[PDB]
Amino acid sequence: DECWSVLEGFRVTLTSVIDPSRITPYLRQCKVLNPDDEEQVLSDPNLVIRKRKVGVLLDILQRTGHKGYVAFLESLELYYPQLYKKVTGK
Amino acid sequence: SDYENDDECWSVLEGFRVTLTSVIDPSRITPYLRQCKVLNPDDEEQVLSDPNLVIRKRKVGVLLDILQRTGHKGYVAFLESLELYYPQLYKKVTGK
């Protein structure tokens, strides 16, 4: 049908206002975004932007003390194994 | 002797900060960290939000293209998400 092509006139309005991370959880639960879709939308290919977001993440985790430190290292061992070895001396 | 106590553990990662922040794509690990109970949903939204319009616009464009490929089901779901989270946009694109 024609629903999406009709919405095209509003594309720039939509893209200017929406912060995608506010709606991707809803859309994932609707099963119209698969996990690879969401990872694609939310990923940060620009280094400057990525660095800022990781910095904010580290700051949030730091405020939880050792608990966040341990969970963070677990997350590296799972998703960034080479980074894990570098920061833990293994 | 403990050299990563609650007081000092983060300071030991300080020397790796530039590398950590350059290699990690945060959206890949925030779901796991939320399951470890060290990130609240509010924290995760702070991390993943995009304050730069140019970046936001690209990501929403990518999202819209993915949703368009799911046809009418994606359209209905998308409009519901606007009803809830962007009510003024919902009205605008539906004529209210």
Side-chain angles (χ1 to χ4, degrees), chain A residues 1-7 9-38 40-89, chain B residues 1-90 92-96:
Chain A
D1 66 330
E2 289 166 345
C3 53
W4 283 112
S5 61
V6 165
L7 196 67
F10 288 113
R11 182 178 185 97
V12 173
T13 301
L14 294 170
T15 62
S16 298
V17 174
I18 293 166
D19 208 356
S21 59
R22 292 240 303 134
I23 62 173
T24 58
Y26 183 90
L27 297 167
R28 175 86 194 80
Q29 193 67 239
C30 289
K31 314 168 311 190
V32 300
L33 290 185
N34 62 52
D36 288 327
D37 292 329
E38 193 181 25
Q40 182 64 244
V41 173
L42 299 178
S43 63
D44 301 296
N46 301 122
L47 168 72
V48 176
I49 302 292
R50 190 164 64 246
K51 282 175 84 156
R52 292 179 196 165
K53 294 185 173 188
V54 179
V56 171
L57 175 60
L58 293 174
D59 179 86
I60 288 161
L61 293 174
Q62 172 259 313
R63 292 187 265 113
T64 75
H66 188 69
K67 286 171 293 187
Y69 170 87
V70 173
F72 182 62
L73 288 182
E74 291 190 81
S75 81
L76 302 188
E77 197 177 5
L78 289 160
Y79 294 102
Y80 292 98
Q82 292 308 114
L83 191 58
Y84 177 74
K85 287 189 271 198
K86 184 175 186 179
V87 306
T88 68
Chain B
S1 182
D2 194 343
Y3 301 139
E4 304 131 280
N5 63 27
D6 191 70
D7 289 311
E8 296 175 341
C9 59
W10 282 102
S11 70
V12 320
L13 279 182
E14 200 56 44
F16 295 109
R17 183 173 60 207
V18 170
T19 289
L20 294 165
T21 62
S22 302
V23 175
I24 294 169
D25 216 338
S27 65
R28 291 184 56 83
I29 64 173
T30 57
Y32 179 82
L33 296 167
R34 210 179 60 245
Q35 279 172 54
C36 294
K37 300 308 197 189
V38 298
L39 281 188
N40 317 317
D42 286 1
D43 296 334
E44 181 178 42
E45 191 55 56
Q46 189 57 237
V47 172
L48 297 181
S49 65
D50 309 292
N52 301 117
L53 172 70
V54 298
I55 304 293
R56 221 161 43 239
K57 284 181 78 165
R58 182 185 306 143
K59 293 182 173 182
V60 181
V62 171
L63 177 62
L64 289 172
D65 285 3
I66 292 165
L67 293 171
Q68 281 165 37
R69 287 204 297 277
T70 73
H72 190 69
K73 184 185 197 193
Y75 177 81
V76 170
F78 179 64
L79 285 189
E80 289 174 355
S81 81
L82 302 187
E83 279 196 75
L84 294 175
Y85 299 110
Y86 292 95
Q88 292 288 90
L89 261 186
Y90 175 76
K92 190 189 281 292
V93 306
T94 62
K96 325 183 189 315

